Design a protein around this ligand. Structure first.
Ligand code: C6S
Length: 358
């Protein structure tokens, strides 16, 4: 059995790796509560380090699901509410347009046209981050247009930490990751763990690791391994396995709020009906969904993302490419971590091939 699944994953991953020149890749699969890991290639082409289920990858915007779990905790402890105006949790923003923007709009990228990235002139400094939001003028009315945005959900995470009374980075290290049982998950990789930190590769195989930037922790900062990230996936498949406060914090992120095409937007997670064709799942994770605006169709009420559904999230840095997906009704979870930023369509292709069947 374990040899037949290894042959499936190997048939799913190996062609895509060679086709995209991916130096190293790690797959972690959860089925019926049983873990399975599959390692391919090299974490470092220079020093010949091989990929293992403990290899640390940059998961990029998959971090947004962790940020959402943090926000989920604040909501369950009644320190904030999704319809709260943004400037309520940051007095410096009072008098700016964020007096009429809800946290939900920020969490779900519908504030009114916040861009993908902070301007290059905005540095990792609170005052510059403050000034940026203070002078920002909307392109659209709130809650009408989705524009994938790090400033948007980054502010969402930053305000969640404020409502809790501590910085975002500290709350993650000392509460979230320990509460989720994650010891191989970091925002700032300890010096003792750097040996497990895979090298990233891009155009011309120039080495690429992520550097500092405004609200980087909230938007795309997590580094973890396939095994540790699968622990997180399992925690999403079985929130009851955690203490009550953190079970409710994960269930909070399993709530859909509006649709765009086949994709239902939750907190961090993006959901699809299952089964669904590969082309449609690829279309939902394609570049236009990240760089271009889209009108939304709001659901009459929060829709639980449970049952025959596929929750997922992509993640890309300059040198890494991750994809996470799980299916509640099937009790199946999947993690694909790679040290090259290769097309999301290819990430979904690997995941879809594996999911095909059982
Ligand atoms: B994030 O990784 O999500 C993302 C994706 C995706 O979902 O796969 C695709 C294109 C852009 C983004 C934005 C996020 N990534 C970053 O902001 C990244 C930019 C380069 C430097 C490190 C952070």
């Amino acid at each position: 059995p374990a040899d037949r699944l290894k042959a499936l994953v190997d048939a799913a991953v190996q062609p895509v790796m060679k086709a995209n020149d991916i130096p190293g890749l790690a797959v972690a699969i959860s089925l019926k509560g049983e873990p399975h890991y599959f390692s391919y290639g090299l974490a470092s082409k220079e020093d010949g380090r091989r990929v293992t289920p403990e290899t640390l990858f940059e998961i990029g915007s998959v971090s947004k699901t962790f940020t959402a779990t943090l926000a989920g905790y604040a909501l369950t402890q009644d320190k904030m509410r999704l319809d709260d105006r943004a400037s309520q949790h940051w007095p410096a923003l009072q008098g700016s347009r964020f007096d009429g923007i809800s946290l939900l709009d920020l969490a779900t990228y519908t504030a009114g046209g916040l861009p993908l990235q902070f301007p290059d002139s905005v540095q990792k400094d609170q005052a510059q981050i403050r000034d940026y939001y203070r002078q920002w003028q909307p392109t659209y009315a709130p809650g009408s247009q989705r524009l994938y945005s790090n400033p948007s959900i980054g502010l969402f995470g930053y305000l969640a930490a404020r409502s809790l009374g501590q910085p975002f980075e500290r709350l993650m290290e000392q509460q979230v990751f320990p509460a989720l049982g994650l010891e191989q998950t970091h925002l700032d990789v300890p010096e003792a763990a750097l040996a497990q930190y895979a090298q990233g590769y891009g155009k011309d195989d120039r080495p690429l690791r992520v550097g500092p930037g405004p609200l980087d922790a909230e938007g795309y900062g997590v580094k973890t391994s396939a095994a540790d990230l699968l622990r997180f996936v399992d925690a999403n498949l079985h929130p009851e396995r955690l203490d009550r406060p953190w079970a409710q914090a994960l269930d909070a992120t399993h709530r859909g709020y509006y649709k765009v095409g086949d994709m239902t937007q939750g907190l961090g997670w993006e959901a699809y009906d299952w089964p669904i064709s590969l082309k449609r799942l690829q279309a939902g994770n394609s570049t236009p969904m990240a760089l271009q605006p889209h009108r939304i169709a709001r659901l009459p009420a929060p829709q639980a993302l449970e049952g025959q559904r596929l929750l997922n999230k992509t993640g890309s840095t300059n040198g890494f490419g991750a994809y996470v997906a799980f299916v509640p009704g099937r009790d199946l979870g999947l993690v694909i971590l790679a040290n090259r930023n290769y097309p999301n369509a290819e990430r979904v292709k690997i995941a879809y091939a594996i999911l095909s069947g059982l």
